[PDB]
Design a protein around this ligand. Structure first.
Ligand SMILES: *[C@@H]1O[C@H](CO)[C@@H](O)[C@H](O)[C@H]1NC(C)=O
Ligand SMILES: *[C@@H]1O[C@H](CO)[C@@H](O)[C@H](O)[C@H]1NC(C)=O
Ligand SMILES: *[C@@H]1O[C@H](CO)[C@@H](O)[C@H](O)[C@H]1NC(C)=O
Ligand SMILES: *[C@@H]1O[C@H](CO)[C@@H](O)[C@H](O)[C@H]1NC(C)=O
Ligand SMILES: *[C@@H]1O[C@H](CO)[C@@H](O)[C@H](O)[C@H]1NC(C)=O
Ligand SMILES: *[C@@H]1O[C@H](CO)[C@@H](O)[C@H](O)[C@H]1NC(C)=O
Ligand SMILES: [Zn+2]
Lengths: 251, 588
């Protein structure tokens, strides 16, 4: 334990968090957008301390720890819902939004951010531009999107493609006015999902990396996992920068 | 698949489609009421037409689901609410005739002149402060001889048309249609019947006759001093000396009938003026009073969207105290507030309405209403009842903290309360009994006024000053009778008010007289109330009543326990005076 070394990839590009969060137009909950952000350094501290979010809930990660973890991929899903329906954006819950619109798996690792949007999505009269699915034969499997507009039949009589008795159009609109309550006001939601694979890490935090040493007992922190021992050029770690392979030996 | 599942799908679609339409109609209505222009009336008419057409079409659609298949008992309630035919069962010509009759009766009642003097306020001021026999008799007789004579032919056809409409909807008569509100079925142990409301009202009234008889004897003895030879010591009270056009309220008789006139009442208007209250501290204080019991605060938009002061000279509005629930989580209050005690109490009344409207907002669209007719106003009234006590005034800061409370003040207060509460139950009971009898056909068309006056003499203890022939229609002179409004909701409300007050005071551990009870700073009472408020129309009214008072029916014992000091004092006072009335004596 004479020295401590940390090794991270030398990526310097900043992640496009602003494009996701500062977006001009969002998407309907039934047809939600997915963006993959990679090959960048991600600083979630400023995002967490922005203090403009009504909801910031992280599942499976710690709010402060995730600043120095390396993820293979990061996905961001953005949409707009009602104020009361933000409760349904969480693993292991039920409702019209968690059954037919957007389902999160029970073993979810990521964060959920939600903030009020009454000053952007509400107009005198009504918005009537954000839809959501009301009827469906089966529940949505986790991370599945359905965008069909087929006529839902509730009875034995066939619909024949035209709505009528026991034949409904599933997609119904949200009506937003600036005079509604808090539970009837638009909320913008961004869900960040962190994916780890056997591939080398690509998205990492802003942690400086120092020089490496060999043949001495030191403390090492490679791509997020730590250890103590002697690093010998050849229980085995592959450092990111110099593409070498090091063996760990007890000291 | 099954009928219940299709009904559930249809109800989901209907709720989603109906909430927005109701919200838009309410917005148009609020816009007209706050700002009176010629543009807003068209917006109201169009929004109302859209909402009515949507409701009619959805009712016709919902009629296709048989009601025997559903066993959920919560889907069944909403389907029953939608499936109601209403007056559409009548033919087109008959429907047009009925609507024309109703519009003509309302218009003729509204436009009535005595030559000229209008009822508001020319006749009301005379009937309130004349203190002269001849003038009061002339004012009382002229309005009847004009309106009742001009309204008699229309009511006769109104009755038969409404009876046909009600018998078309599988009821016995239109009175049965009115009684259908107090009906529970399909629930074991909480059942109720339309014919059971004929009972349980007579039973409650036979327990009020002693107190009302003593009050009537006291009022007659005190009123005999003003008019020397126009009142008999064994007869009934003439109908034109009761401080009102109809005698519904005896409040105006307070000036003559004061127990101890030297001792004043509690009027905190001067304290409010000197402390510079400005129509915003009143509602903040009401919100504090409601929070201290455990109920939530007012929403953020309640403060910025609502109107709490007159618009001004440039903008005109019809500002009566009203609480608006526009839907989609939007609650407001429309009221012109000035610095008095009456507005201080009306603020608590209206916020009681508002807090009742907030509780059941999680219910479906069709179940967002009070359990029955009397629940909403009783809940509103108990808050104003509790907020007027001297203890509550002293805790707030207005009224001196060393006030002297004695027997005279409480007797004055109790008499002033009973001149309004007790003095109106016999009138309501008699009027609703007469209307039910007319609808049922028991009273023939040629014996209307005779039976009306005989019932008034036997029950209310009031006689007419001049005889009236069959060409008169005295009952139609009342606003509710000509404008087709139910009138038994002013009886159950009065009973439920005192039942709730006694239950809450038993929850708040108050010791002493019931009329000095206060409910503030107690959270158990708040929880006991909120357990019933959140139910809405989902549960039977018997079950909702049980959650506060512990009974499945209304009782009159709390009402008599409230007025015990007054009853004892009146019994002491009437030792010499005669108690009871004789129907033979007449002014002529
Ligand atoms: C979004 O816009 C605000 C306002 O300019 C800005 O402060 C913020 O940095 C932008 N990006 C994010 C991720 O909030
Ligand atoms: C970053 O690391 C890669 C890994 O081989 C290397 O090729 C590249 O030159 C490095 N860039 C800088 C600026 O150090
Ligand atoms: C009321 O209506 C008049 C004319 O319709 C308009 O000039 C005025 O601004 C309105 N006031 C409010 C408070 O809406
Ligand atoms: C009635 O249906 C509702 C859902 O619409 C359900 O929650 C409730 O349990 C049902 N009641 C019965 C008695 O089946
Ligand atoms: C309403 O009227 C229609 C007209 O035929 C009838 O079929 C239906 O049974 C009625 N429903 C009720 C509840 O009266
Ligand atoms: C209620 O409690 C407050 C203390 O929070 C006290 O100031 C007030 O006088 C109390 N009022 C009553 C009526 O007990
Ligand atoms: Zn009221």
């Amino acid at each position: 334990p004479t020295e401590s070394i940390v090794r991270f990839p030398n990526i310097t590009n900043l992640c496009p968090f602003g494009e996701v969060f500062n977006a001009t137009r969002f998407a309907s909950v039934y047809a939600w957008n997915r963006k993959r952000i990679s090959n960048c350094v991600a600083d979630y501290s400023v995002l967490y301390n922005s203090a403009s979010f009504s909801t910031f809930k992280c599942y499976g990660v710690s709010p402060t720890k995730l600043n120095d973890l390396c993820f293979t991929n990061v996905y961001a899903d953005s949409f707009v819902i009602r104020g009361d329906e933000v409760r349904q954006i969480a693993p292991g819950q039920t409702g019209k939004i968690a059954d037919y619109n957007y389902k999160l798996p029970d073993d979810f690792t990521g964060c959920v951010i939600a903030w009020n949007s009454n000053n952007l999505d509400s107009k005198v009269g009504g918005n009537y531009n954000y839809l959501f699915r009301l009827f469906r034969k089966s529940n949505l499997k986790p991370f599945e999107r359905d965008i069909s507009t087929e006529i839902y039949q509730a009875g034995s009589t066939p619909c024949n493609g035209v709505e009528g008795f026991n034949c409904y159009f599933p997609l119904q609109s949200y009506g937003f006015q600036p005079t509604n309550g808090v539970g009837y006001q638009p909320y913008r939601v961004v869900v960040l999902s962190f994916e780890l694979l056997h591939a080398p890490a690509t998205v990492c935090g802003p942690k400086k990396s120092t020089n490496l040493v060999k043949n001495k007992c030191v403390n090492f922190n490679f791509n997020g996992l730590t250890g103590t021992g002697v690093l010998t050029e050849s229980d085995a770690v592959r450092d990111p920068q110099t593409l070498e392979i090091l063996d760990i030996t007890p000291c | 698949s099954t009928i219940e599942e299709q009904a559930k799908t249809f109800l989901d679609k209907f709720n989603h489609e109906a909430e927005d339409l109701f919200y838009q109609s309410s917005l148009a209505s609020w816009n007209y009421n706050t700002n009176i222009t010629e543009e807003n009336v068209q917006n109201m008419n169009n929004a109302g037409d859209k909402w009515s057409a949507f409701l009619k079409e959805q009712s016709t659609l919902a009629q296709m689901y048989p009601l025997q298949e559903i066993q959920n008992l919560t889907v069944k309630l909403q389907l029953q609410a939608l499936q109601q035919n209403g007056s559409s069962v009548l033919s087109e010509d008959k429907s047009k005739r009925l609507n024309t009759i109703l519009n003509t009766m309302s218009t003729i009642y509204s436009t009535g002149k005595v030559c000229c003097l209008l009822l508001e306020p020319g006749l009301n001021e005379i009937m309130a402060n004349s203190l002269d026999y001849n003038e009061r008799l002339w004012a009382w007789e002229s309005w009847r001889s004009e309106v009742g004579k001009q309204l008699r032919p229309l009511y006769e056809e109104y009755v038969v048309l409404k009876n046909e409409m009600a018998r078309a909807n599988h009821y016995e008569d239109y009175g049965d249609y009115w009684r259908g509100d107090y009906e529970v079925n399909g629930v074991d142990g909480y059942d109720y019947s339309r014919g059971q409301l004929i009972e349980d009202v007579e039973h409650t009234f036979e327990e009020i006759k002693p107190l009302y008889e003593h009050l009537h004897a006291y009022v007659r003895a005190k009123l005999m001093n003003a008019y020397p030879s126009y009142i008999s010591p064994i007869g009934c009270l003439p109908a034109h000396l009761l401080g009102d056009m109809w005698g519904r309220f005896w409040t105006n008789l307070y000036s003559l009938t004061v127990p101890f006139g030297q001792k004043p009442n509690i009027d905190v208007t001067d304290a409010m003026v000197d402390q510079a209250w400005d129509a915003q501290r009143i509602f903040k204080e009401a919100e504090k009073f409601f929070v201290s019991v455990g109920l939530p605060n007012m929403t953020q938009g309640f403060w910025e969207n609502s109107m709490l002061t007159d618009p001004g000279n440039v903008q005109k509005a019809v500002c009566h105290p009203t609480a608006w629930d526009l839907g989609k989580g939007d609650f407001r209050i429309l009221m012109c507030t000035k610095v008095t005690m009456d507005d201080f109490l009306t603020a608590h009344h209206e916020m009681g309405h508002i807090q009742y409207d907030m509780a059941y907002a999680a219910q479906p669209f069709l179940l967002r209403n009070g359990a029955n007719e009397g629940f909403h106003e009783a809940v509103g009234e108990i808050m104003s009842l509790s907020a007027a006590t001297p203890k509550h005034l002293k805790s707030i800061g207005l009224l001196s903290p060393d006030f002297q409370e004695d027997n005279e003040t409480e007797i004055n207060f109790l008499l002033k309360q009973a001149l309004t509460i007790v003095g109106t139950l016999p009138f309501t009971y008699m009027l609703e009994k007469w209307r039910w009898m007319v609808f049922k056909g028991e009273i023939p068309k040629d014996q209307w006024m005779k039976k009306w006056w005989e019932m008034k003499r036997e029950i209310v203890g009031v006689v007419e000053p001049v005889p009236h022939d069959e060409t008169y229609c005295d009952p139609a002179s009342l606003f509710h009778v000509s404008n087709d409004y139910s009138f038994i909701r002013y009886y159950t409300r009065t009973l439920y008010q005192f039942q709730f007050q006694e239950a809450l005071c038993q929850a708040a551990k108050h010791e002493g007289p019931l009329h000095k009870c206060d409910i503030s700073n107690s959270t158990e009472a708040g929880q006991k109330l909120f357990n019933m408020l959140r139910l809405g129309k989902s549960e039977p009214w018997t079950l909702a009543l049980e959650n506060v008072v512990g009974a499945k029916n209304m009782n009159v014992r709390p009402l008599l326990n409230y007025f015990e000091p007054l009853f004892t004092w009146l019994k002491d006072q009437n030792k010499n005076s005669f108690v009871g009335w004789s129907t033979d004596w007449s002014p002529y």
